[PDB]
A paper describes a structure:
PSI-BLAST search predicted that LysIME-EF1 consists of an N-terminal catalytic CHAP (cysteine, histidine-dependent amidohydrolases/peptidases) domain and a C-terminal CBD (cell-wall binding domain).
Fortunately, we obtained diffractive crystals of selenium-labeled protein in different crystallization conditions, which were then optimized and diffracted well in the space group P1211 with cell parameters a = 47.03 Å, b = 56.92 Å, c = 91.52 Å, α = γ = 90.00°, β = 96.29°. In addition to the full-length LysIME-EF1, three additional CBD fragments were successfully built into the final model. The four CBDs together form a tetrameric ring 45 Å in length and 45 Å in width. One side of LysIME-EF1 tetrameric CBDs, which we speculate to be responsible for recognition of peptidoglycan, is arranged in a planar surface, while the other side is more convex in shape. The N-terminal CHAP domain of LysIME-EF1 folds into a typical globular domain containing two α-helices, two 310-helices and six β-strands. Electron density of the calcium ion is clearly identified in the crystal structure, and the calcium ion is coordinated by the conserved residues D20, D22, W24, G26, D31 and one water molecule.
Residue numbers in the entry:
A (entry chain D), C (entry chain A), D (entry chain B): 168 to 237
B (entry chain C): 1 to 25, 27, 27A, 28 to 119, 121, 121A, 122 to 143, 168 to 237
The structure:
């Protein structure tokens, strides 16, 4: 489990959570707090890196880790 | 595994200060118990103090209704649940074995100069047994994960995460076997309770499909 | 990644390999050896436990970890 | 998260990246370098082993870890 940031085409910076081989967009503070708490509980990785939307590392993560909503 | 002296050093070190574990009403009684249990055992007890009487407990924990102070051991989580305390309860940590004269010593918040709004600092209190229900005895030395879910209808379910899936555990034998898996395969022994509407839980439930056993 | 043994209903002992969230039955000692080399390479768990076919820990692993055939 | 090499039947060597229970063929060095950077960030395994195409350990990985594309 971990969180990363994505610098999007339109210039915003988005928080994303990887858990269960999936990724969850964290749109608001409330999501972000809860995800950080999961990381602390379950020994998630605390590296926070920012990826530009066209970074290949990001592309590989996005191909491998389906997105799930809410 | 956890050393009693570590807990007692930490608890005695808090005397005169306060901890706020939840961000509500400053340093209440449950805040201390929750802090200590989270730091040392990776367990976040749920609810007010009185919910310690019957909420599920992590592997290795014991709960005992106490008739006598002599049953209290150092490092026990004390539970008040009778009389005035039946509504909300009280809690704190036993720093010594209970004494033969019906008394014991615990470090508690919000006992001395109690406050509904801001609670009060941890103090070492010489108590009697008035209102005491019993103890939770953590598993001390020499004497894949599970989570709990508090349902809309007011029950507490235990759930097991394994292989990117989640399994509802129907009985305590299922619980025991999941804890054995955790032990064997180096799973995480953290135990937390989530209310059914918690966003942490919602993310977990969306990421980890349910499978039935 | 790990191996476990299953005692089947008919009383044979099967070796199974957990990898990538899946279970693989190991049909021959060559497969078992290769599985153990994988464990060693990739930091897998070296615990070997024997499960009877009706063990609830076994049942929960079989439910959660789909079988794939080699 | 780790990388392995595969020597194919026709004699070329392929680099493959394992992530999220999936495997990704790394088509260029830029993809390789970004995979290596993911491994370092997220505490992936740094073992690098080459498997001949016929190897049973490789066949088990290939069965258990679906391919995703990029
Ligand atoms: Ca508080």
């Amino acid at each position: 489990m971990f969180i990363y940031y994505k610098r999007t085409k339109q210039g915003s910076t988005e928080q994303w959570f990887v858990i269960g081989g999936k990724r969850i967009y964290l749109p608001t503070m409330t999501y972000v707090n809860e995800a950080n708490d999961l990381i602390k509980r379950y020994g998630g990785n605390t590296n926070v890196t920012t990826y530009n939307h066209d970074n290949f590392g990001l592309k590989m993560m996005e191909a491998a880790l389906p997105q799930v909503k809410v | 595994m956890v050393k009693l002296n570590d807990v007692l050093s930490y608890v005695n070190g808090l005397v005169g200060k306060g901890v706020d574990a939840d961000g509500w009403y400053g340093t209440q009684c449950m805040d201390l118990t929750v802090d200590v249990m989270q730091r040392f055992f990776g367990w976040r007890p749920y609810g007010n103090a009185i919910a310690l009487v019957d909420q599920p407990l992590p592997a290795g924990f014991q709960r005992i209704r106490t008739t006598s102070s002599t049953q209290i051991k150092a490092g026990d989580v004390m539970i008040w649940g009778l009389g005035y305390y039946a509504q909300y309860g009280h809690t704190g940590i036993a720093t010594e074995d209970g004494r033969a004269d019906g008394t014991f010593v615990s470090v508690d918040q919000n006992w001395i100069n109690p406050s509904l709004e801001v609670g009060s600092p941890a103090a070492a209190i010489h108590h009697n047994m008035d209102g005491v229900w019993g103890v939770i005895r953590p598993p001390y030395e020499a004497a894949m994960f599970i989570y709990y879910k508090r349902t809309k209808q007011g029950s507490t379910e235990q759930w097991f995460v394994i292989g990117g899936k989640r399994i509802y555990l129907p009985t305590m034998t299922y619980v025991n076997e999941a804890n054995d898996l955790i032990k064997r395969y180096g799973g995480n022994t953290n135990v937390t309770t989530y209310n059914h509407d918690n966003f942490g839980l919602k993310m977990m439930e969306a990421a980890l499909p349910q499978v039935k056993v």
